[PDB]
Symmetry: D2
Subunit: 180 residues, 4 copies
């Protein structure tokens, strides 16, 4: 029927997300006021948050995107992933802001962060809509965080279950029958 028919509970409402994005955007705009950073999202989950975040960030910036895929074993050990789409511009000397939907193990993100430092970024910071710090497999701290969630079992606003639900305007938890 309707997608709400699959949602057990709304954890973060659209109104709550909108207020947070407004707040974070104002903070990021002030922190990068005299340097046009490169704001980068990792496909696909970061897309909705990145779009609304940046639209509330009143400062000059450039957008870009990466796509990556798992190598399997090395990905779940060091976070190394295969670059499917690299950035359209060089990193050297740039201030990089990685926009993410959620950080859990933090392995792939940590790999990307240190890749950008290898590429001589002037700086690298991270903004994430959701953080689950109890999931860390590496010490990786986001610089800007929307909400801290006790678990990563949620859908909406970029987050998927079998590639669906990313288009929900809120963050929720699925009913058990959907996945089991």
């Amino acid at each position: 029927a309707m997608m709400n028919q699959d949602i057990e509970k709304v954890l973060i409402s659209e109104e709550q997300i909108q207020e947070k994005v407004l707040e974070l955007g104002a903070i990021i705009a002030e922190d990068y006021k005299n340097t046009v950073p490169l704001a980068i999202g990792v496909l696909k989950g970061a897309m909705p948050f990145m779009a609304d975040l940046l639209k509330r960030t009143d400062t000059y910036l450039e957008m870009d995107f990466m796509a990556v895929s798992s190598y399997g074993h090395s990905t779940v050990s060091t976070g190394e992933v295969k670059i499917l789409k690299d950035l359209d511009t060089s990193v050297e000397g740039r201030d990089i802001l990685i926009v993410e939907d959620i950080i859990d193990s933090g392995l792939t993100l940590s790999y990307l962060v240190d890749l950008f430092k290898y590429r001589k970024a002037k700086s690298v910071k991270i903004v994430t809509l959701l953080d689950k710090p109890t999931g860390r497999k590496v010490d990786l701290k986001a610089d800007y965080v929307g909400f801290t969630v006790p678990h990563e079992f949620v859908v909406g606003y970029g987050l998927d279950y079998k590639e669906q639900y990313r288009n929900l305007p809120y963050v929720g938890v699925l009913k058990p029958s959907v996945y089991s």
Copy 2:
């Protein structure tokens, strides 16, 4: 020292874009009620509109993205472009909805539509925020359109000038001094 100071005039306000996105999403949700389409955005310019449109599209769908680059002359004459990032899933038998920020010549978008048909898509439809039909170099009509514009000399809500301004939450016209 800030962006709005580079804008001569707002052509479509943020409020007009939100109302339009709301309307378009309700139409698209109805049209695709039965089957879960694959909604595709071509990076980078389609991202903000795609995020906000799909958030307002209350139906089951899958999101995906493509990245392409110019080959030079064939791109300008046939629309043929290099695929830098192909879809994550196969096209055969799927209903495809391409989400675009603006259609002008329509050459590349047409190359992509007919590629998806070569790949045996069940159907291919297009939703664009902006359309400039006077600019066409191929017969390509969008199925869903936000606003009809004159000229592609506009920035904001995905549209850039030298990679900047895409993060404005409205569509505007730059002051002549910005681009000389």
Copy 3:
């Protein structure tokens, strides 16, 4: 984590027999190069190899093709369902130049089901190639899952578990200078 034991093992010990020797491959490559050079007298084709298996053959063939031409490469990967039925694959690396108006020569190590290659040929036709032809070192036409005849063929094979000269078994043996059949013990 990973420990490797090769001891004094040599690849030839894994080979039951040499099916197509280096000498045989080189004589056929020389003939094919002369025929292609004559056929493409009037054009400069875009010769494309699909990574990884086509590489050794493509290098030797083109070195024996005395005519102007350009080289390019593609990389693709399976979608897991439409790949087995339609040949549709994900493009991981597209060509570095446009196909429009070019005479395309696809260089392959082996054609078996032919599904992916059939997909690529008609993609290049959609992209307005002036012509598309295929040269394959080996052909296993009994494996076909679609109607696809290569324009130039080195050898007909039927065998299972063939390796060498770009053909692999679990990513090994591509660097052999001949085409061999593996001992059954190697793959049990």
Copy 4:
């Protein structure tokens, strides 16, 4: 006559019907027979050096393909092949080596012995970027084999572990090396006539 265009950002190429490559070459610098003898030697050295491990031998497209094919077929040891493709980010690639990855390795680098196979090294900037990318990815070791070397042309410190031939002041094409995408398919390394390139 015949013509075509290629990228880039476009060039138009016009050929007379009886134009032949060889006549574009002033002299053969390194003959096919010299190359065969060198690959045989290097292949044997490489097989001995990598007797204890299954290396990942990686070619950077497009130029490295012919040498890589011939060298590896003379390298009688267990190994895996892979390929990368890269693009320039413009003037910044020219000064730092940083390039856009268009095709990454099909397998992970962590813990692997990587052997990069190149056609020529001159400034060394891009290769150096790739070597240290693999070290960032925790390669067990990274070594380089190049057919041709111009070591006084370096803009970064990078010594190739294995080198076929050192090239002097000559504009070379063939055996993977191009001029405007032509000549890669010559079975030798030739000195291109000044008239061809100005």
